[PDB]
């Protein structure tokens, strides 16, 4: 399991309660117990922030739901408070997820007094934590596969939501980690890995090789587009580009290998050999170039066993001409994934703490 996940952004603790209570007793002049109800909700909301972003400890669904709930709560608050006009100043400080900084300028962090900044960074951590949960699923288990498929698509859609909204939501230029180009690439990586999970589910369920090949071919397209966005950039961690390049080639080889089984079933023995030769060449390229990052020894042996038997029998029995790769029909593509739209509420059983306001 060589899957890419994203580290969560860190933030400093903020007293969320104090500035909110001061600016509720001014629109609603009360003596307490009536608007003290809403004031208690602000204490709950400051507690919710500390729970959602204050202790990056575990990778279970309790932590994700807490982050999702905190995201829902924030989005539900910008309307009730006319924050387009300047009042209730609140600085959120977030560190870049990827840029370590140096010893000359400290870490890379940004402080902005804007709920758009906060909910962008919170949504980043929702997507990142979802990617970590997906990447740690047992993919030799149907429930692990299902969990990973759902979470990669969620992560893809949340990174994509950040891409489309982060610039208008902020008054400054964002840090690079949440900038449209970076989260656009993260979105496509999660989309690729979701497609890979569907391929692994089809393989595990022993679906028709025609379908497995189109699923792998689609995954190759996604991985290929992802690595092309990371060809000239060093934003993401070191291991992302070679893993993407390897997965692109591995998924093309899986497409060819499963298409070659279809060719054999149709008695197209020349074509089977041509496709196995292509798969072998791709896997040899991955083995020699990306060995530190993937383990293709078992897949290589499977291809070579198939190709040896294929050639032995074609030379001795069938004498099919082995077509050139250019003369083979393209393998189709089947996409089973989509970037999940972010439509608040994204957390379960959501109840807005400021609903009656």
């Amino acid at each position: 399991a060589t899957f890419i996940s994203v580290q969560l952004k860190k933030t400093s603790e903020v007293d969320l309660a104090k500035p909110l209570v001061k600016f509720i007793q001014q629109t609603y002049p009360s003596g307490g117990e009536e608007q003290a109800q809403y004031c208690r909700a602000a204490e709950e909301l400051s507690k919710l922030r500390r729970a959602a972003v204050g202790r990056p400890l575990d990778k279970h669904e309790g932590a994700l739901e807490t982050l999702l709930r905190y995201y829902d709560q924030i989005c539900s608050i910008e309307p009730k408070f006319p924050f387009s006009e300047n009042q209730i100043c609140l600085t959120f400080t977030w560190k870049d997820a990827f840029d370590k900084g140096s010893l000359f300028g400290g870490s890379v962090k940004l402080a902005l007094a804007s709920l758009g900044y906060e909910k962008s960074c919170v949504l980043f951590n929702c997507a990142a934590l979802a990617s970590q949960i997906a990447a740690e699923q047992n993919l030799d288990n149907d429930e692990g596969l299902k969990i990973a498929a759902k979470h990669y698509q969620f992560a893809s859609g949340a990174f994509l939501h950040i891409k489309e909204t982060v610039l208008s939501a902020l008054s400054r230029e964002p840090t690079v980690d949440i900038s449209p180009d970076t989260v656009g690439t993260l979105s496509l990586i999660m989309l690729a890995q979701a497609q890979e999970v569907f391929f692994l589910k089809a393989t595990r369920d022993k679906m028709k090789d025609a379908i497995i090949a189109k699923l792998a071919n689609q995954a190759a397209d996604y991985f290929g587009d992802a690595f092309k966005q990371c060809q000239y950039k060093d934003t993401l961690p070191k291991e992302v580009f070679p893993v993407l390049a390897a997965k692109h080639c591995i998924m093309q080889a899986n497409a060819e290998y499963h298409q070659s089984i279809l060719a054999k079933q149709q008695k197209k023995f020349g074509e089977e050999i041509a496709r196995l030769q292509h798969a072998a060449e791709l896997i040899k390229t991955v083995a020699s170039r990306y060995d530190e990052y993937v383990n293709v020894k078992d897949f290589s042996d499977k291809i070579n066993r198939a190709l040896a038997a294929a050639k032995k029998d074609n030379d001795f029995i069938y004498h099919d001409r082995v077509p050139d790769l250019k003369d083979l029909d393209p393998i189709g593509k089947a996409t089973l994934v989509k970037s999940t739209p972010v439509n608040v509420p994204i957390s379960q059983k959501f109840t807005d703490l400021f609903e009656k306001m």
Binding site: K146, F198, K201, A202, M207, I211, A334, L336
Partner: peptide
């Protein structure tokens, strides 16, 4: 082929 990916999709929900 068409129905086989229908089931795949349905499994994910």
């Amino acid at each position: 082929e068409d129905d086989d990916i229908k089931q795949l999709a349905a499994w994910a929900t």
